[PDB]
Amino acid sequence: GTLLDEAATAFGGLGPSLQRLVDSTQAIAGDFRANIDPVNDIIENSGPIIDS
């Protein structure tokens, strides 16, 4: 009973919100992998100019 009450409190009406959370997570992760070369370039080459 306690576990069911806690699960109901945690997942009352979060259906659409959790759906949006999962969809956003997967979209952002896929797009981030798709653009990993620009991210690596930024990380590598930001330091020289900034420290200059």
Binding site: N40, I43, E44, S46, G47, D51
Partner: protein, 51 residues
Amino acid sequence: PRMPQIRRDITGLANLGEVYADASPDLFDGLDNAVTTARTLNEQRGNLDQA
């Protein structure tokens, strides 16, 4: 693997922000007065070219 570079970037960003925030009021006052003299130069472009 590129985490030391991330740390370097963050520390440099903080230092550069500090330097820019220290040097910004003079830069913007100079930009105001440079706007004044640039307006003056624009109003007399023909005079400058003839000169």
